[PDB]
C-alpha cells in the first residue's frame, strides 16, 4: 500500500512488564475489592 516500512523508530516490541502488569493490575484490583464484606454470620 502507500507509505513504506522500516522508516523511523516505529513502535517498540511487546514488553513483559506491560502484559504482566496489565493482567496483574486488573486481576489484583478486582481480586482484592471482591472482598468488601457484609456477610458476618456471627454464629
Amino acid at each position: 500500500v502507500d507509505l513504506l516500512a522500516v522508516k523511523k523508530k516505529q513502535e517498540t516490541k511487546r514488553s513483559i512488564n506491560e502484559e504482566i502488569h496489565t493482567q496483574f493490575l486488573d486481576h489484583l484490583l478486582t481480586g482484592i475489592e471482591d472482598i468488601c464484606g457484609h456477610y458476618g454470620h456471627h454464629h
Partner: protein, 195 residues
C-alpha cells in the same frame, strides 16, 4: 445450618468499598464492623485465619496479594489503620491531576504509593523488591492457565531476566516506575465499572 451461600458483590458490597476509596462515609464504617468482627469476636484487628472467612482468599489462586495487602509477613493482626489504608489505597488521583492546588491533598494512592501498594502484594519475602520466587509464583499462576511446564519455566526465567532493570534479578519499583511513564496505571487503581 449448611446452605447455598454463594456470595456476590452487589451494589451494597460495591458501594461500600467504592466509598472507601471514593469517599469515607459510614457505609464503610459498618463494613469494617462485620469484616473486623470476623476476628473470632475480637473487633480490633484481623489475622490470616480471619481473611479466609471470605470466599475470596479461600478461592484466590495467589491471594498473596490480599494477605500482604492488609499486613506484610511479620505482623499477625491488621488494625483499622491499614484496613482503610488498603481498601482505600484505590482512591483516584485528584491532586496531581494536572492541578496544583485542590483543597485536601492527603498521602494515599499517590505515585510513590502506587509502587508501595503493588509492592506489598508481590512483596512476600520483604526482599524490598519482587524476587523470582515471588514473581514466578504469580506470573506462573497468571499464564500457567495455558502454558506447558518447560514452556512456563522458560517464560518465567526470561521474564525476570529481561525486565531485570535494577539488575537485582528482581523488580518492584524500577522497571515498574519506568513502565508508568508509558501508562498512567496510578489512575487505573480505581474500581468503578460505570461507563
Amino acid at each position: 445450618m449448611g446452605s447455598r451461600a454463594s456470595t456476590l458483590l452487589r451494589d451494597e458490597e460495591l458501594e461500600e468499598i467504592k466509598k472507601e476509596t471514593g469517599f469515607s462515609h459510614s457505609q464503610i464504617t459498618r463494613l469494617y464492623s462485620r469484616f473486623t468482627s470476623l476476628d473470632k469476636g475480637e473487633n480490633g484487628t484481623l489475622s490470616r485465619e480471619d481473611f479466609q472467612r471470605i470466599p475470596e482468599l479461600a478461592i484466590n489462586p495467589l491471594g498473596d496479594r490480599i494477605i500482604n495487602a492488609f499486613f506484610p509477613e511479620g505482623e499477625d493482626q491488621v488494625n483499622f489503620r491499614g484496613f482503610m489504608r488498603t481498601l482505600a489505597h484505590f482512591r483516584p488521583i485528584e491532586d496531581n491531576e494536572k492541578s496544583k492546588d485542590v483543597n485536601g491533598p492527603e498521602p494515599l494512592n499517590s505515585r510513590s504509593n502506587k509502587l508501595h501498594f503493588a509492592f506489598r502484594l508481590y512483596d512476600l519475602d520483604k526482599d524490598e523488591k519482587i524476587s523470582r520466587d515471588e514473581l514466578l509464583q504469580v506470573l506462573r499462576m497468571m499464564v500457567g492457565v495455558n502454558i506447558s511446564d518447560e514452556q512456563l519455566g522458560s517464560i518465567a526465567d526470561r521474564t525476570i531476566q529481561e525486565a531485570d532493570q535494577d539488575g537485582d534479578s528482581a523488580i518492584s519499583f524500577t522497571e515498574f516506575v519506568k513502565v508508568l511513564e508509558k501508562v498512567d496505571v496510578e489512575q487505573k487503581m480505581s474500581i468503578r465499572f460505570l461507563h
